[PDB]
Amino acid sequence: ASLPVTQYSPPVTPLGKSTWNVTGSTNPPGLVPQVVQTESINARKSNIMSKISVYYYIPSTNSVSCCTEWDTIRCEFSLTLLQLSSNTDVAARTVDVLDTMISFLAKRRNSILAGNLLLPDNP
Amino acid sequence: ASLPVTQYSPPVTPLGKSTWNVTGSTNPPGLVPQVVQTESINARKSNIMSKISVYYYIPSTNSVSCCTEWDTIRCEFSLTLLQLSSNTDVAARTVDVLDTMISFLAKRRNSILAGNLLLPDNP
Amino acid sequence: ASLPVTQYSPPVTPLGKSTWNVTGSTNPPGLVPQVVQTESINARKSNIMSKISVYYYIPSTNSVSCCTEWDTIRCEFSLTLLQLSSNTDVAARTVDVLDTMISFLAKRRNSILAGNLLLPDNP
Amino acid sequence: ASLPVTQYSPPVTPLGKSTWNVTGSTNPPGLVPQVVQTESINARKSNIMSKISVYYYIPSTNSVSCCTEWDTIRCEFSLTLLQLSSNTDVAARTVDVLDTMISFLAKRRNSILAGNLLLPDNP
Amino acid sequence: ASLPVTQYSPPVTPLGKSTWNVTGSTNPPGLVPQVVQTESINARKSNIMSKISVYYYIPSTNSVSCCTEWDTIRCEFSLTLLQLSSNTDVAARTVDVLDTMISFLAKRRNSILAGNLLLPDNP
Amino acid sequence: ASLPVTQYSPPVTPLGKSTWNVTGSTNPPGLVPQVVQTESINARKSNIMSKISVYYYIPSTNSVSCCTEWDTIRCEFSLTLLQLSSNTDVAARTVDVLDTMISFLAKRRNSILAGNLLLPDNP
């Protein structure tokens, strides 16, 4: 289930960070699950990295206890946008790469969620 | 457009690497675009990392030339599967995190592809 | 008398700085009295500091002279918002603390303005 | 809600410290919430600092446990009283600065309590 | 001919940078011609520098080749806004200085464009 | 208002400096406001820099006093004329860059004069 979100820190400039907070969380505010989109330039200014990061902070136990730690379910995504290429195929091929990524997230959902390469493709 | 693929190196064990090759590519075989799924254990065996990586090798110019270099369009995805947590919410919350990732890839497609945080959500 | 202000640098993100300028000032622009609100995270991300700062730049003499220096009337306020506490009383108690602060600013106004602890409470 | 207080250490001299204790607290006496007013002279005797400090000691958990720590909700206020200025505006302008402080505590109450600069002014 | 522009990074605060991109450019995106306005404070806070910068990236050759480098046509403008002056003429005189700058850009256009001081004033 | 000028040091060679003095100034002659046009070659002889500089010397106070200092309102302009480029677009594009500079000086006049990026374009 896609988590419900509201934009906490809105986008300011084309580059930088934007953050959404997951609404309805029960944990303290500093541990509210977050989604962060990042658009950053490389040092040599050859690539722009587009990143999405989902940090879901979950307690190590079902109930509150003294040994209760905070684990983090992390889901990361990054994509390279070439900035200095003379090849006009770059845009269409970046689109194709992103679509292949989404298709594989669908195709290998069970394998990804179970940590087992041997599971067949999702139906 | 999702790229067409055929499985080149098939899965062997639950952990490790599996690779698909993009079919119909024109570049030399060592530069055939690839999709790699990785399932790896952490050192302390606390997390299993599920990764998907799309490497699309594209020439720096539209035609063949002597200064033709090979740029790489890279798209990476990773997800942490907690292995030592007593919290029974871990499975459902990892599912929710993956779904939030996919939802955000849909929601921010234009921003991700353009490298501009200020673009509105995709319709 | 509350000074009249207009927002000079508006808020950009939930954290950071916002500044208002005092309108109708006679001193040069770089010495315009300012009000600055700051929302900053701690290093360990345990607290968010909410700060208000009033800097009123006033000349050391009544008229312009060669030895005229610029003194600063500074008024600072800070409040700690706990971000990682499991105690649900934190919000109501932070509200109570802020209200106690305002009540004491009323109660001890003469003492605060005169620099004398012995003055009785304001009527 | 303004907390109820009784004067614990009364003012002795114009400079120094005076302390009030919050009545009806349940925590041990050494952790009774306190309000401290301070009137101190600068080293060069140019300023008198008038300070108010509210320390509210709150347990990290709702109930008593072995990992129960004691967090502190801190609210600080300071004001500079110039002592060596020949400008006769100093008194009225310090009054204006204090009033601006109180007005801003009213104006930005929600932002201060939430740690978010983007919240609109309180109605 | 004035180049057509669209605002890429909009102004955020009174100080900082704002950037416009030149529309309709044929070179790769990282080499899109840019116009940057900067408003920065001096270290001693005596001056505010207002700057405009036009960076036009142009290939060293008319056609694409392996030795094709990227030259930059740079046009810079700066103006000092005094922030701590008691002279009330500062505003009108800064206006006069800016107008003299524009008048000289008109008067010496041919000389500026040809790199020859001896050319007569433009008609 | 464009300042009135008379040519003090006339142009001698295509490269070098030419200076105009602002007429009707009240300050001593060594502090007469000046406009300087410079045409200089780069070390590697790749660029010719065309520069215009307006130095307006203004007293720090409205009247004569013993602490009266002399501030300088500085307005600088520079343009790069490529000297070793085989691209025939260089001339037209340098013209376009200069026109973009003038257009932006018109477009952002209020922002430039106020030191505030947030001001809207001039009407």
Q: Give chain A as a 3 state SS string.
A: CCCCEEEEECCCCCCEEEEEEECCCCCCHHHCCEEEEEEEECCCCCEEEEEEEEEEEEECCCCCCCCCCEEEEEEEEEEEEECCCCCCCHHHHHHHHHHHHHHHHHHCHHHHHHCCCCCCCCC
Distance CA(C75)–CA(C37), nearest Å, equals: 12
Option in F67, F116, F118 nearest C66 (CB): F67
F45 φ/ψ angles, rounded to the nearest 5 degrees: 60, 30
What are the chain A neighbours of E72 within 8 Å (beta carbons)? none
Report residue C113 as tokens.
């303005």
What are the chain E neighbours of B114 within 8 Å (beta carbons)? none
What are the chain D neighbours of C116 within 8 Å (beta carbons)? 14, 39
Determine whether E6 is exposed, middle or buried from the number of CB atoms within 10 Å of its CB (0-12, 13-18, 19+): exposed
Strands A70-82, B70-82: parallel, antiparallel or unpaired by DSSP? Answer: antiparallel
Determine whether F111 is exposed, middle or buried from the number of CB atoms within 10 Å of its CB (0-12, 13-18, 19+): buried
User: Locate tokens 């502190």: which residue?
Assistant: D72
3-state helix, strand, coil in chain E (%, to 5): 20, 35, 40
What are the chain E neighbours of A84 within 8 Å (beta carbons)? 28, 30-31
* Ramachandran region, residue D45 (left: φ > 0; alpha: ψ -120 to 50; beta: rest): left
Q: Give residues with Cβ within 8 angstroms of B25, minimum separation 6.
A: B31, B32, B33
Q: Is B35 in contact with B20 (CB distance < 8 Å)?
A: yes
D91 φ/ψ angles, rounded to the nearest 5 degrees: -65, -55
Distance CA(E112)–CA(F81), nearest Å, equals: 9
Radius of gyration of chain A (CA): 18
What residue in E sits closest to C68 (Cα-Cα)? Answer: E86
* Ramachandran region, residue C24 (left: φ > 0; alpha: ψ -120 to 50; beta: rest): left
Cross-chain residue pair E102–F102, CB shorter than 8 Å: yes
What residue in D sits closest to A30 (Cα-Cα)? Answer: D115
Q: How far are the Cα atoms of B52, B93, F78 from residue A75, in angstroms, in the given order? A: 11, 11, 49
Residue type, C3: L
Stated as kind and residue range, the H or E segment containing B96 is: helix B90-107
Q: Is B7 in contact with B17 (CB distance < 8 Å)?
A: no
Over the range B32-51, which residues count as b (16 or more CB within 10 Å of their CB) and which as e? bbbbbbbbeeeeeeebbbbb
Chain B interface residues facing chain E, Cβ-Cβ under 8 Å? 61, 65-67, 118
What residue in A sits closest to D114 (Cα-Cα)? Answer: A29
For CA atoms D14, D15, D16, D17, the dihedral sign is positive
List D48's β-bridge partners, or say none: D41, D81
What are the chain E neighbours of C29 within 8 Å (beta carbons)? 83
Chain C interface residues facing chain E, Cβ-Cβ under 8 Å? 8-10, 12, 28-31, 64
Cross-chain residue pair E58–F93, CB shorter than 8 Å: yes
Report residue D76 as tokens.
């600080």
F101 φ/ψ angles, rounded to the nearest 5 degrees: -60, -50
Q: How far are the Cα atoms of C65, C70, C74, D44, D95 from residue C61, in angstroms, in the given order? A: 8, 9, 18, 19, 18
| F93: closest CA of chain E, how far (Å) | 8
List A55's β-bridge partners, or say none: A34, A74
Option in C12, C14, C83 nearest A30 (CB): C83
Candidates D67, D117, D119, partner chain A, best to mutate (most A CBs within 10 A): D67
Q: Which of C27, C51, C32 shows the shortest CA–CA distance to C41?
A: C51
List D59's β-bridge partners, or say none: D70
User: Locate tokens 């701690």: which residue?
Assistant: C42
Report residue C106 as tokens.
């009323």
Q: Is A57 in contact with A72 (CB distance < 8 Å)?
A: yes
| A13: closest CA of chain E, how far (Å) | 6
C78 φ/ψ angles, rounded to the nearest 5 degrees: -140, 150
Experimental method: X-ray
| Structure letter (DSSP) for residue E30 | G
Distance CA(A14)–CA(A38), nearest Å, equals: 10
What are the chain B neighbours of A27 within 8 Å (beta carbons)? none
Option in C8, C10, C66 nearest F65 (CB): C66
Option in F87, F101, F116 nearest E75 (CB): F101
